Design a protein around this ligand. Structure first.
Ligand SMILES: [Cl-]
Ligand SMILES: [Cl-]
Ligand SMILES: [Cl-]
Ligand SMILES: [Cl-]
Ligand SMILES: [Cl-]
Ligand SMILES: [Cl-]
Length: 103
């Protein structure tokens, strides 16, 4: 699980096939809840998926870009292009479902 920033967000996206981007903030409790879940996700799909984390407090223009207004927001990118969105703090199986739809 790596960090993405306003500078390298587009590099990372065009550099990897499948990228799961977690829009989060340090002060958010449902963020903290899915955080260990998303790295089990990272392990499970270690070779076909890159998990990235976007701090919306440090990267407001990136959050503004995709209009991420409420977090635990997870967006799936399939070829630099967004294909799935998960808006709540959710069970691991819900992420697994949308990842495998594009595997
Ligand atoms: Cl690629
Ligand atoms: Cl920014
Ligand atoms: Cl939530
Ligand atoms: Cl459950
Ligand atoms: Cl499990
Ligand atoms: Cl689950």
């Amino acid at each position: 699980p790596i960090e993405v920033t306003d500078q390298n967000f587009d590099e990372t996206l065009g550099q990897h096939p499948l990228v799961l981007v977690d829009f989060w903030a340090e002060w958010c409790a449902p963020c903290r809840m899915i955080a260990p879940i998303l790295e089990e996700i990272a392990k499970e799909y270690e070779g076909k998926l890159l998990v990235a984390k976007l701090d919306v407090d440090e990267n407001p223009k990136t959050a503004m870009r995709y209009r991420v207004m409420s977090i635990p927001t997870v967006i799936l990118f399939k070829d630099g292009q967004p294909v799935e969105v998960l808006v709540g703090a959710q069970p691991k199986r819900n992420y697994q479902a949308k990842i495998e739809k594009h595997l």
